[PDB]
Amino acid sequence: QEAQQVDMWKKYIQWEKSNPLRTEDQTLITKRVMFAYEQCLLVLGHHPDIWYEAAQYLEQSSKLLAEKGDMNNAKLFSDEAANIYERAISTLLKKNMLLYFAYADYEESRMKYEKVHSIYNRLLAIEDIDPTLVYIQYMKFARRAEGIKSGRMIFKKAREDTRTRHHVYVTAALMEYYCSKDKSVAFKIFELGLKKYGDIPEYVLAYIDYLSHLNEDNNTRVLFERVLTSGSLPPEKSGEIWARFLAFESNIGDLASILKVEKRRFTAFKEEYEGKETALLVDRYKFMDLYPCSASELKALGYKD
């Protein structure tokens, strides 16, 4: 089938890369290898890995020619690798996020930032695409190559795009905490995001995770109470939150606070946890891969996860 054809082609390409003729001219080995790549891409151009590996090979060759001092062939093969990326996203895979990103990173590594901005915006201009990850990668590039202020602009652009999902908020907040070491901005971003996506369990869990690891008991408990009592998180979508709360109390609280939280949780899920009190108790004691029960005991208890 198609997987067999792909493997055959990659083995032919690897053979050519092994320089069976023992030529000493790297330009000739590269011409032969790229020829094999071209024949392959003629019929397997819908496989993104082949474009990527071909571009990577051309870049590697360019570097090897630069080390030997042949700057002209180095520049030639560098530009031709760029064109490999361009052809890959221009036909067949016009919507492949992975190759757009690879292209962006290649042009970033050549210090051609204008071309990077064009690539990310070309991708963003395709209407029927989820741009969230696109904005995340674009913010990463902006921050690390142009600075905090360029990153904040990309984040602004992401919020104004009605297709964007909550992850960019998470990313921006974490970026401010990890790169700028600024907890106040991190907080404000998480809070704006909470106003907009407080009914999404994965978002709320991200904020909870960030704050918990700040290691301030009162702030953590306050956030737990805010999210679980007020807020928009469906009560039937809150199980993981309660679990994190029980683990927080098990780490910093006493048996009384743990039992209070356990009982509030059970109330919230009185129906779903009928007769499952012992299976829940298991999670009062488990740590990492240590359980208080054997696998057979756990199955007989109705234990899940």
Binding site: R152, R159, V185, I189
Partner: peptide
């Protein structure tokens, strides 16, 4: 607008 961005940073 510039108000949300001012509040954030």
């Amino acid at each position: 607008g510039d108000e949300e961005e001012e509040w954030l940073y």
